[PDB]
Symmetry: C2
Subunit: 324 residues, 2 copies
């Protein structure tokens, strides 16, 4: 870690706020350094080529350390703060600002650091701490791993470094392109029907394993031969429809206890071409309210840039027959 990270952390301390090295058991030979810009999220490919070009500075001929951006774990927070009407001078809009700062001040200080961790109980005491009028808060978290490629998990897998619950793992939705014509003079003569779809996990087996299955289809546009046939279990979360779509299929699988997640859309004869996205986001409920980082993973609150991962509900109180 610090053996080489620190140096770098000297010649570049004006940008990078977090640097640590690690190996991949598997990508033998390769040493990577994750670095987080103090100034946001991803170092720029120019900022990256400069930093790599101090590798020559310190003479090493062997292929030498790949710099790269950190594997972020995000907390989708659903915050609720109840406050006293009397004791609150400015706008609700102000108050939010006042606390959404506190959250960040906790993250920067105690969390946004390698192998340091997020404790929901701590940041709530930060929230409480934001005004002299913030009587008490509560909070509900999710974990977000932002997936680089939707089509197949890495060679190795995707892991949260944390225990999730059953059926918990679920990506967002991405358009699948069937291939049929719609024949609609509204928008010409042909739209190419494309219905949303997601990738969810099902319940632990006898032995700790689930199945990573993929959202609703219309019989025809997925070819089934004995082997590859519709999944049947109802041990997962189906999604809102308006269409006659209820045929989910099975790729990869979740090892709940070892938290590893592998899937590969290929397991059903569907080329990347068929989906109009390239990136997705995987969510899942933690088991605990204390969540952890490990090799090159970093937990981070970047809220003016990932605002989708915080929501604040306030509850103004006076006196009082009622706060819900």
């Amino acid at each position: 870690a610090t053996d080489y990270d620190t140096f770098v952390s000297e010649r570049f301390g004006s940008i990078i706020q977090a640097v640590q090295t690690f190996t991949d058991s598997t990508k033998p030979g390769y040493a990577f350094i994750a670095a987080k810009p103090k100034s946001g999220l991803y170092l720029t490919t120019v900022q990256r080529e400069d930093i790599k070009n101090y590798l020559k500075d310190y003479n090493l001929a062997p292929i030498t350390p790949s710099i790269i951006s950190p594997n972020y774990l995000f907390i989708k927070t659903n915050l609720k703060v109840t406050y006293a009407l009397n004791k609150l001078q400015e706008s609700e809009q102000w108050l939010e600002g006042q606390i959404i700062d506190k959250i960040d001040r906790y993250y920067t200080e105690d969390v946004e650091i390698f192998n340091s961790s997020f404790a929901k109980s701590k940041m709530l005491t930060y929230v409480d701490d934001a005004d002299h009028s913030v009587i008490g808060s509560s909070a509900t978290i999710q974990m977000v791993r932002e997936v680089q490629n939707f089509y197949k998990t890495p060679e190795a897998g995707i892991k949260y470094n944390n225990q999730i619950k059953d059926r918990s793992m679920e990506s967002n939705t991405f358009s699948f392109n069937s291939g049929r014509k719609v024949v609609n003079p509204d928008t010409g003569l042909e739209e190419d029907v494309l219905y949303d779809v997601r990738i969810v996990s099902t319940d632990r087996d006898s032995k700790g394993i689930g199945k990573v299955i993929i959202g609703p289809f219309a019989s025809g546009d997925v070819t089934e031969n004995e082997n590859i046939q519709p999944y049947t279990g109802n041990d997962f979360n189906k999604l809102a429809n308006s269409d006659g779509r209820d045929k989910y299929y099975v790729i990869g699988e979740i090892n709940y206890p070892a938290d590893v997640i592998y899937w590969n859309i290929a397991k059903i004869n569907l080329t990347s071409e068929k989906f109009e996205v390239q990136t997705i986001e995987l969510y899942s409920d933690p088991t605990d309210d204390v969540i952890f980082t490990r090799d090159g993973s970093l937990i981070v609150f970047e809220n003016d840039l990932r605002p989708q991962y915080l929501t604040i509900d306030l509850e103004p109180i006076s006196q009082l027959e009622h706060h819900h």
Copy 2:
């Protein structure tokens, strides 16, 4: 007159073995001036029944209204704490550690919460819990409000309230034994008196006006006599308990007004005599919608772990160290 004037009156003539006073008057009970009194040490003033609450009676000035020196209507917090710490950061035992967090959970209560018209917040106390070591990483909790009920048979004339809002089905008591008149045998033993099963009081989802039933069960088909009035509660709509004895027929005996925050029941509404029940006092648990629990009139949120240990479970969890290498 004036409750405030009275509160003082006692924060003087007794201001010795008394910590706090709430002089409130109940709108259901005219001409009666009620005086809540915290013992400053324990829970009940003359649990010996007056020894004390009679001495204060013996203080008279003016008015046609009469004092009724009572002990405070206590709100309890059944906390299921789940603190987690770092194996290495810890030098003394889990045993010494518990005795360290509850030292804080107490510090919070007795400074901010254990007061009249004062309140409790889970988030705020879990800050105090977290603040007991160099680690101690974080903490979880799962709380319920508890109201201790003397005479399980029936609530007061005017119902019992929490001074807080609870959730649908949230309200449920601990279990108690109901002596069915009947008799059975096993294991070579004999009649074994009268068959007993564990029975209890639960609330149902609120109807379209904010109002569910307060029901009691299960039973046998059974040990309760059904009338035009007395009939098994009609439908699923709440929390049933383990029929390790197979039973299930519950009966309506009151209702919760969720908005008004009032709960009334009377076991006499079916026809069971208190004789058919082992108990006298029971516990009434509900879980709030409140991220803040409010005390109020004669109500008081207190934390007495020593004398009320049952209302706190701490499950610790040790954690492996991270990087020790550099």
